[PDB]
Symmetry: C3
Subunit: 223 residues, 3 copies
């Protein structure tokens, strides 16, 4: 079933609309390109001053705190990379609002006592972006993902870790292996993130349309 209630500017349009969607698509791609390379000045430039992000391993975080704990994770050997997999934009020109839709694979490299493995999670980043009236610059205020499917990837093609059914069961279908593997590192995993189906799926689309309509949104789903 079509999750969108209406249509927004997403293809063709004026040169101004094309260039707005291009600018927003660049912001989205900044997450994989700059985070994976620890280009923190570039990464911070993507966001509003009051921005919040959500991940499986951090839950919601103000962006500056997210950068702090990301640096700490990287210093402790955490190795998360991204593959961007298709980016388009929904633009609301009169509201100065846009949604960036960026398909991706989160590909995180782990060790098991040594057995190397990736967990690859196909997902869709949703960037809630706004245009500064004065400068015309787009910035992201919120980033939250849909989680679609995941898998365990052997690095040598022979050996892979083992997860019990009970170890995987507490996580939503879509990020069970990613959640379980990150939990083994000691992280407290957010279990209230949207997947391909269900309650939080409709909720995410509701908040996306609220944003594009100009409202405040409610992406804080534990209170």
């Amino acid at each position: 079933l079509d999750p969108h209630s209406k249509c927004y500017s997403h293809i063709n349009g004026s040169a101004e609309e094309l260039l707005d969607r291009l600018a927003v698509s660049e912001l989205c791609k900044g997450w994989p390109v700059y985070r994976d390379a620890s280009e923190w000045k570039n990464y911070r430039s993507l966001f509003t001053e009051d921005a919040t992000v959500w991940t499986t391993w951090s839950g919601p975080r103000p962006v500056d705190e997210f950068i702090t704990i990301s640096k700490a994770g990287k210093e402790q050997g955490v190795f998360i990379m991204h593959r961007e997999c298709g980016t388009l934009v929904e633009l609301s020109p009169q509201q100065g609002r846009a949604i960036g839709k960026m398909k991706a694979t989160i590909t995180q490299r782990f060790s098991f006592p040594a057995i190397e493995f990736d967990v690859d999670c196909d997902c869709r980043f949703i960037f809630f972006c706004e245009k500064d009236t004065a400068s015309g610059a787009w910035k992201a205020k919120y980033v939250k993902l849909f989680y679609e499917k995941d898998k365990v990837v052997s690095v040598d093609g022979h050996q892979a870790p083992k997860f019990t059914k009970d170890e995987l069961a507490k996580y939503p279908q879509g990020y069970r292996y990613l959640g379980a593997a990150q939990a083994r590192l000691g992280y407290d995993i957010d279990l209230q993130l949207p997947t391909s189906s269900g309650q939080l799926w409709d909720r995410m689309y509701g908040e996306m349309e609220n944003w594009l309509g100009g409202n405040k949104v409610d992406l804080f789903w534990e209170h």
Copy 2:
């Protein structure tokens, strides 16, 4: 050997040509972004009223029929996703014609009696696009793929299905695992789709250049 007989607008150029290639590249990315999310209003907006698409599992279909059977497949648990892998455009400004070249991986999740597995097929979508003279809007009239290579992907890193040599043999090299796995679902697989080499490879490039030259094309290869 270089399959192109000549060169078209593909890099640099005027701002108008850059923005035309950008608009066409967005159309291409609409297939992965909108089909994977069942955003059917957005997906239908990519196409002309008389558009036709080709897939391994459907053969040629008018786009509205393709949407109907895609919805039916999804209701029956079919789980096809796409990873877009690099998109560029060949533009013929005087003909109001363009070809979108979108590298992708078709990644389809299957079950085997239960063993979960993906088949990942590296391919290249070819979007035959035309510009409305009145509105200036680009739309896709035809979509057909080159199929380059495929593989079976274990989801848990340990278990994978088994395909006999005879089960794989009827399919062209490039989509043998994808065809064989989709056939197990009951689909009648199109065996006349182009791959990295051979008769239909040259034919596809011939039709691409015919389109860019302004002709009608013949992508219907069974009559």
Copy 3:
């Protein structure tokens, strides 16, 4: 730690800057799209007349020589494909210089006496691009990669080759499986390419900033 000493034009900006970054991002994507399809006229159009490229299997090569040996490799059955994984640009408008940052997976299909396998190497292509003052056209003068991680991929989901520890040990971490598998084909592998960490990582960022500052660069790291 943030490897960049300063910031360049990378998001938002004027329409002219947006369109310059778009044009450079297209050049980058030409490598996967045109090389994988043997579209050699298109591929050669990406480069300056005096361009040089670096790969694991060729070392540094003037681009026309690289095309010659790539054609020879393909005739001998070499099967390298690319998946583009996120592309952004650093622009220095006053210098007429840009750096294209293109995340990618090199995915090379091999045989072992027969066992089919891929090696997939996550990497970042760095395109050193310059703008022709007369025409305004962007072209790439240098292409060199960061190599981040790699893995062996079973094609049938059951069988995979075996590499000894000693066979992998001479290569930098980031492309050990890719180097080892290409060496089995008879290629002499360049061992002085940058990875996620260390001496050549800082050197690459130094040369990137030198380029953006307008200098000649020194990417020739064996003399």
